[PDB]
Amino acid sequence: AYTNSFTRGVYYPDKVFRSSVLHSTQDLFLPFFSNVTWFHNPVLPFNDGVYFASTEKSNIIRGWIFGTTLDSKTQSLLIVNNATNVVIKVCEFQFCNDPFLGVNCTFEYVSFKNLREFVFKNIDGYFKIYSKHTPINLVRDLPQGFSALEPLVDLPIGINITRFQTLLAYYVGYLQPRTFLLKYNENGTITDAVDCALDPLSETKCTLKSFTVEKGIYQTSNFRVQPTESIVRFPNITNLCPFGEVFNATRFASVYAWNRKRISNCVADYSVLYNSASFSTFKCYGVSPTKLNDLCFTNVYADSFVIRGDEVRQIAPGQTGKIADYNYKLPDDFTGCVIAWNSNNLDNYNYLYRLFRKSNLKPFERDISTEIYQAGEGFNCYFPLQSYGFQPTNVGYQPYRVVVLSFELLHAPATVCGPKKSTNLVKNKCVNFNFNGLTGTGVLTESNKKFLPFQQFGRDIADTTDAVRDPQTLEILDITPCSFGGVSVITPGTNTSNEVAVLYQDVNCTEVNVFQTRAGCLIGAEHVNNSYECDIPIGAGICASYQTQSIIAYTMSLGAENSVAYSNNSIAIPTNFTISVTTEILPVSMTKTSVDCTMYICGDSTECSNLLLQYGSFCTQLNRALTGIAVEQDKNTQEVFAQVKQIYKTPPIKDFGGFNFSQILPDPSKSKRSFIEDLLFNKVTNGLTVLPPLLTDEMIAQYTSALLAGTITSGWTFGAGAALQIPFAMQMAYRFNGIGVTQNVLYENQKLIANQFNSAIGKIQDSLSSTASALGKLQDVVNQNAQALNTLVKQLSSNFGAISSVLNDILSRLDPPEAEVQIDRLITGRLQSLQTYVTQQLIRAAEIRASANLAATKMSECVLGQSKRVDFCGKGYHLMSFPQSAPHGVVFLHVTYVPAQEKNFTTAPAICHDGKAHFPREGVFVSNGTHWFVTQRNFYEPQIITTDNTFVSGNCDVVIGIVNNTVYDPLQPELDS
Amino acid sequence: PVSMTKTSVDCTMYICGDSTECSNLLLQYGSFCTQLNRALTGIAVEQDKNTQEVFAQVKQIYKTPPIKDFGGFNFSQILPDPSKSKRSFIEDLLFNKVTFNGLTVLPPLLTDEMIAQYTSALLAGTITSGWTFGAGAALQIPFAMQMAYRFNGIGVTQNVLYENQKLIANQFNSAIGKIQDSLSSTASALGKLQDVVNQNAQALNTLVKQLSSN
Amino acid sequence: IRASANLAATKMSECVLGQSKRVDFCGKGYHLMSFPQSAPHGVVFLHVT
Amino acid sequence: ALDPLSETKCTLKSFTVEKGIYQTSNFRVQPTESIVRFPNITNLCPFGEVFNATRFASVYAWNRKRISNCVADYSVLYNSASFSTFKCYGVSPTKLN
Ligand SMILES: *[C@@H]1O[C@H](CO)[C@@H](O[C@@H]2O[C@H](CO)[C@@H](O)[C@H](O)[C@H]2NC(C)=O)[C@H](O)[C@H]1NC(C)=O
Ligand SMILES: *[C@@H]1O[C@H](CO)[C@@H](O[C@@H]2O[C@H](CO)[C@@H](O)[C@H](O)[C@H]2NC(C)=O)[C@H](O)[C@H]1NC(C)=O
Ligand SMILES: *[C@@H]1O[C@H](CO)[C@@H](O[C@@H]2O[C@H](CO)[C@@H](O)[C@H](O)[C@H]2NC(C)=O)[C@H](O)[C@H]1NC(C)=O
Ligand SMILES: *[C@@H]1O[C@H](CO)[C@@H](O[C@@H]2O[C@H](CO)[C@@H](O)[C@H](O)[C@H]2NC(C)=O)[C@H](O)[C@H]1NC(C)=O
Ligand SMILES: *[C@@H]1O[C@H](CO)[C@@H](O)[C@H](O)[C@H]1NC(C)=O
Ligand SMILES: *[C@@H]1O[C@H](CO)[C@@H](O)[C@H](O)[C@H]1NC(C)=O
Ligand SMILES: *[C@@H]1O[C@H](CO)[C@@H](O)[C@H](O)[C@H]1NC(C)=O
Ligand SMILES: *[C@@H]1O[C@H](CO)[C@@H](O)[C@H](O)[C@H]1NC(C)=O
Ligand SMILES: *[C@@H]1O[C@H](CO)[C@@H](O)[C@H](O)[C@H]1NC(C)=O
C-alpha cells in the first residue's frame, strides 16, 4: 500500500543547537517520496531501522515487541502504561505465547484528531525514543507539513533489533543510510529538509548546501556502471596439493640444512589449515591469514626447519640474531606467512646451529660447512656447529618448530590456486572478473594481439594489466573498464521551476525523452534543432535553456549573424552616439589574515610545541610567507590608491558644467562616501586574525574621495604634476580630441551630452542597485577567502586519519607514547592543510596582484590620465574613468564613446581636381550620391573639401580608385571673390 | 600559448578509485581531495574563461562576400577554405604540422570547428571594416583606405602608399607565400605551443606513473 | 598561461581589434595590423610591420 | 628575555635591527584558573542499599543486581570506619573515582 511522504521521518541527529545555519549529516533516515506500509500484528523486519507513524483514536495500541527473535529467547522490549504508571524495559519477563498483560531484568525503568509519530531505535546500547503529537483534520493519508521527532529520553538497554510487531491503522517505513541536509531556523528548530538521494535537483541542492540553488551546471557525483555479474577465471589445475606432506609431515630437517621444495601444479586449500588450532602463531605479512583461500600464486617455495623458542621473533623480515646472522636469514621485504606450532609436544641431540662465520648470508641462501672455525685445521679451531639442548626428558627452553610459506608473487604461468570455481565467460559486460587473482571491472573482448608463447599478460603505461591470457582456453582478451564520469545536473533555477535535466559526460545512451550528443547522453532535455544564445554551457556547443514551459537543448548561437556589406566603394559613418559606461569591477586586495602554528594547530599545548620544534623552520617560514602576503596586500593598496601625494578637495560650488556628480561626489552625512559608494557598501556584504588594513574603511574612503575629486576637478594635470584646474567643458573637449573628434561638435552637443551623462549615471544607479552581478568578482573573492578560512577551520574538526580531532580529548585519553604518534599524524595532516591553504593564498595573492597591477595601470593611465588603448578602459573609444571605493576592490566608471546612428555613403580612396591627387589631413572622403564631402572618422561632420583639410600631391594616373572632384581652398575665394 | 587541455581529474578516481574502503579512509582526511577537485574544476572553468576572453570578444559572426576584392591582397591562405572544416590553408597546415584512469579530458566549450568560426568572424570583420567592427558598428572601408590610415598612424603619408600600391600588394602576397613556405618547412615556429602541450602531457604521464610508484 | 593569455587578449583587442602604437608590442618595427589564425589550444599572429 | 629591543634582536638573528615593525611572539592572556561543570548529583544510585546496606545474603545465594544510572561515591568507603578493612586489588584505591 504505497503513500506520499513529503518530509515525514526526520529526527534530530544530536543535541547541538544551531541558529540560521544549514547542516548536512548522514544517518538512517526515511527517504523522501518513499511509499511506506499502510495497515488497518505482523512481524516486520528492522533491517536498518523503521520509521513509525501511528494514528491512535482510542489508545488501542499499548506497546511493541522489539528484537531479533522476539519469542522470549533473548531480551525483548516491552512498554506498557496501565493508565497510572508506565512500565518500560527490555526485561526478560515471563511472556505468554503471544506476549500481553492481563486487562535477567536489565533495565529498571518501572515507573483523526492527533497524529502520533514514533521512531524506536537503539544505537551503541542507548535506546533513542523519538515522538511527536500534533493535531490534524484529515483521514486520507499523511498531511502536508514538516515535523522533527525529538528524542525525549535516552535508555541504556543494548539489544539487537531486526523484527518487531504492533500490540493493539498505522504506518511503518524503513530507514536507510542516506545523506540528508537539515535547515535550522533562528529559534533553533528544523523547518525543512532535502534528501539528496531522491532526484538530481535534490542532489544539486545537497552539493550546493542551499535550499535555493542558482541556475547553472554543477557536478554532483560520478556515474559508474555497476557489475551485473561475477566472472571467475582460473586454470584447470584441479590437482590437489600435498600440503599434508609439510604439515602432517613426520620428518623435518634442521635449520643448518633447511630443505626447500618448489610447489607447482597444485590446489592451495588453506581452509582447514587456517581453521586448525595447530598453529600457535600465524603471522602473515605479505598476505592475510583469512584471505588465503582466494589468492592464487604462480610459483611458491616451502621451507622446513627447526628453531628455538626465544628466536620466534627472528623469523621475520628485517630481523637479526644467531640464526638470522650466520645460519639462515629472511628477506627484508619477504612476502608470505610464518607458521610456528606449539611443538613442545611434537618436537634428541640432533638439531644444529652455527656459531661463527664470515658475515651474513643472503636471504634463502643455503650454506653448508662443517669446519674452518673463526679463530679457535685440527687446532683449537674445530667443528663450528653445536647441537640444541633438547631431550625427550626435557616453556621458553622447549622446542618450537617453524614452517615458512615463502609466497613468490612473481609474474608467471599460474600453478597453485585456491579452491575456487570457474564461471562462464561473458563479453561486453562490466562484471567483477577474477583472472588468476587479478580483479576489477571491465569488458572482456576478443583481442587481436599476438602474444608470444612465453609472454603471459600485457600492460599499459599505467602499469595496469591491459590484456590477460585466459588460462583455461588460450586466448587473449583486452581489459577495458566501461563508461564512467562525473554527473552534471542542469537546473534552470528553483526560483522559476523544479524540472531539471541530466548530462552524462562522454557516455553513449546505450549504457544508461533521451538525446545523445557529442558530450555524451543527455537525459531530461528535449533536443531542439533551433539555435539560441545560451546561458548554461553543456559541452561542444550544446546548451540548455528554459523556454515555453520546458527545458530546451540546442546548439549555441555563435552570435547575432550579421553579414557585413563589405565592398569596394561603400562605407558607413556614425551620425549619433551614446555615452554608455560599464561598471568594471576588479578586486585589488584580500583580507589580511595571519595564522600562528600553535594557535591554529593545537593552541596552548606544550607537547605540541615540543613535537613541532623538531619540524625545523616550517613555522617561521609559514609566518614569514603570511606576513609577506599581508604586506603585499598593503603594498597593492598603496600602489592602487596612494598614487597622488596631495589630498585635493572640491570647491564649495558644484557647477560641474551641468554634469550631476552628486551620485559620485562624497557625502559627509555618515564615511565621506558617494551615493554609489554607499550603495556598494550596502550591496556588498582560532589563531586567525583579520589584521586591519593600513588604510581602514574611513581612510580608504577619504583617499578614494580625494582621487575622484582631484580627477573630476583637474582632469589629468593633478597626476601629471601640480594640479592645474581646468573647466570640465574643456576637459571633455580634450578627451574628445584624444579619440579623433573635434571640440566644435561637443560645444554644439553640450547640453544633450550633459543630459545623456546624467541619464547614464541614473541608469548605472538603477543597475548597481538592482542587479548585483557587476560586483560578482568581488563577491567571488570574498566567498573564496571565507571558504578557505572555513575549510582551514573545519580541518581542525577533521581527524586526518587520527583517532579524533579534539587534541584536548586526545591528550587526556591517550598515554604519552601513542599520543606522540597520534599528535604526529595530527601535525602532518594539519600542516599539510595549512600548507595547501598558504600555497593557495600565495596563488590568489599572485592573481590578485596581477589584477591589482592591471587596475593600478588602468587607473594611473585612465583616471590620472586618459587611456588610448582599444578596449582597455571599456568597449569603444575611451574618454575618462571615475573610481569608486569598494570593499577589497575598486569600481570604475568607464566613460566611452559608442556610435549609434549610421548612413550609407559613397566613398573613394582619393580625389583628383586638376591632375593632382588630394588627401585629407584627418578625416574620410565620402559622398551622399550627388555632392562630395569630407568628415571625421568617428563622427559624421560633413564639410566642404578645403585645402585647410586636404592638400595637392602627385598625379592621378597611378593611383587606383581615385575619382574626379572639385576642391575648395579657403584662400581661393579670398583671392578671386 | 592560449589554452590548456582541460584535464579534469576526480580525486578518488585518481588516487584509489573504485574502492569503498579506501574512499572511506580518504574521507577521514577532511576535504583535501574535495577542495582539490573544486580547485581543479576551477582551473578547468578558468581555462574556458580564458578561451572566451581570448576568442569570443565579439558578439557577431561576420562573413566576407563571394568576391575576394581586397585590393589585390590574396587572403585565401588566411581566409577559411569552405571546400573542406571551415579552416584556412595556413590554419589547416598548423593543424597538420602539429598533431582512461579517472583523468578525463573534458571537451572544450569551444570545439575546433567553433574556434575556426570565431577566428573566421574576427579576421573577416578585421579585413572588411578596419577597427570599426571592434569600436562600434561594423563600418566597411576600402582596404586601400585602411592601409592609408595605418600608414598615417605611424607617421608616413599615404601618397607613397598610393604611388607604390602595386609593389606593396606584391610584397604582401610574396610575404604570405614566404610564410606558407616557413610554416610548412620549419615547424619550429610552433615550438612554444609544442613545449606547452608536451609539459602538459609530461605532467599527465608523471601523474599516471605515480600510480606505478610504490 | 593566464598571464600570457591576458597578454594575448590585450594584444588581440589592441592589434587585431585595433592598432597598437607601442613599439615592439606587435612585433619588431612600426605596427600596422595583425591577423589571427586558429591553433590547437593556441593562436598565431601575422604582424604586418 | 630582557627587553622588547632584545626580543627583536633575538628573533631576527642579528645584533643590528633596522627600522620597521616585527612580530616576535604571541601575547596570550593565560587562563587564571579552571572551572568544571557537570550535571547535578541527582539520579544518584541506590548505593546506600549496597554501601550503607543493612542486610546481605549467603555465599551460595550470591545474586547479581544490575543497577543503572549510578553515581559512585567512593570517598565514604575509602574513609569508612565502620568497615575495618579496605584491601583493594584491581586498581589504586585513591583513584577509584
Ligand atoms: C592430518 O592428520 C590427521 C591425523 O590423521 C588427520 O585427522 C583425522 O582426520 C580425518 C579427516 O576427517 C578423520 O577421518 C580421522 O578420523 C582423523 N584421525 C583421528 C585419529 O581421529 C587430518 O585430517 C590430516 N590433515 C589435516 C589437514 O590436518
Ligand atoms: C541621438 O539619439 C538620441 C536618443 O537618446 C536622440 O534623443 C532623443 O530625441 C528625440 C527627438 O526625436 C526625443 O523624442 C527623445 O526623447 C530623445 N531622447 C531622450 C532620451 O530624451 C537624439 O535626438 C539623437 N540625435 C539626433 C541628432 O537625432
Ligand atoms: C542629481 O540627481 C539627483 C537624483 O538622484 C537629484 O536629486 C533629487 O532632487 C529632487 C529635487 O529636489 C528631489 O525631488 C528628489 O527627491 C532628489 N532625489 C532623491 C533620490 O532624493 C539632484 O537634484 C540632481 N542634481 C543636479 C545638480 O542635477
Ligand atoms: C546630398 O547632400 C546635398 C547637400 O545638402 C543635398 O542637397 C540639398 O537639397 C536641398 C533640397 O531640400 C536643397 O535645398 C539644397 O540646396 C541642396 N544642397 C546643395 C548643396 O545643393 C542633396 O539633396 C543630398 N542628396 C540626397 C539624395 O539626399
Ligand atoms: C546480538 O547479536 C550478537 C551476535 O553475535 C549476539 O552475540 C548477542 O547475544 C545478541 N544480543 C542479545 C541480547 O542476545
Ligand atoms: C569592386 O567590386 C565591384 C563588384 O562588381 C566592381 O564592380 C568594382 O569595379 C570594384 N571596385 C573597383 C575600384 O574596381
Ligand atoms: C546600407 O546598404 C546595405 C546593403 O544594401 C543595407 O543592408 C544597409 O541596411 C544599409 N544601411 C542603412 C542604414 O540602411
Ligand atoms: C592569388 O594568387 C594566385 C596565384 O596562383 C592568383 O591566381 C590569384 O588571382 C590571386 N588572387 C587574387 C584575388 O588575385
Ligand atoms: C554511609 O553511612 C555513614 C555513617 O552514617 C555516613 O557517614 C556516610 O555519609 C554514608 N554514606 C553516604 C554516601 O552518605
Swiss-Prot record, chain A:
Changing N160Q: Increased resistance to neutralizing antibodies. Changing L273I: In strain: Omicron/XBB.1.5, Omicron/EG.5.1. It comes from the Viruses. InterPro entries: bCoV_S1_N (IPR032500), BETA_CORONA_SPIKE (IPR042578), CoV_S1_C (IPR043607), S2_sf_CoV (IPR043473), Spike_N_sf (IPR043002), Spike_S1_N_SARS-CoV-like (IPR044341), Spike_S1_RBD_bCoV (IPR018548), Spike_S1_RBD_SARS-CoV-2 (IPR044366). Changing N248Q: Reduced viral infectivity. Glycans are attached at residues 35, 82, 104, 160, 187, 228, 230, 236, 248, 495, 508, 529, 548, 568, 576, 660, 904, 928, 964. Changing N345K: In strain: Omicron/BA.1, Omicron/BA.2, Omicron/BA.2.12.1, Omicron/BA.2.75, Omicron/BA.4, Omicron/BA.5, Omicron/BQ.1.1, Omicron/XBB.1.5, Omicron/EG.5.1. Changing S278P: In strain: Omicron/BA.1, Omicron/BA.2, Omicron/BA.2.12.1, Omicron/BA.2.75, Omicron/BA.4, Omicron/BA.5, Omicron/BQ.1.1, Omicron/XBB.1.5, Omicron/EG.5.1. It is a single-pass type I membrane protein. Main component of the anti-COVID vaccine Chadox1/AZD1222/AstraZeneca; in which the human tPA leader sequence is added in N-terminus to enhance protein secretion. Changing N394T: In strain: 19B/501T. The keyword Coiled coil applies. Residues 239-419 form the BetaCoV S1-CTD domain. Contains sequence and structural motifs very similar to those of a bacterial superantigen and can directly bind and activate T-cell receptors. Activation of a broad T-cell repertoire may be involved in the hyperinflammatory syndrome in acute COVID disease. Belongs to the betacoronaviruses spike protein family. This is Spike glycoprotein. It comes from Severe acute respiratory syndrome coronavirus 2. The lineage of its organism: Viruses, Riboviria, Orthornavirae, Pisuviricota, Pisoniviricetes.
Curated annotation (Swiss-Prot), chain C:
It comes from the Viruses. Disulfide bonds join C15-C26. Subunit of the fusion protein that is processed upon entry into the host cell. Mediates fusion of the virion and cellular membranes by functioning as a class I viral fusion protein. Contains a viral fusion peptide that is unmasked after S2 cleavage. This cleavage can occur at the cell membrane by host TMPRSS2 or during endocytosis by host CSTL. In either case, this triggers an extensive and irreversible conformational change that leads to fusion of the viral envelope with the cellular cytoplasmic membrane, releasing viral genomic RNA into the host cell cytoplasm. This is Spike protein S2'. It comes from Severe acute respiratory syndrome coronavirus 2 (2019-nCoV). The gene is S.
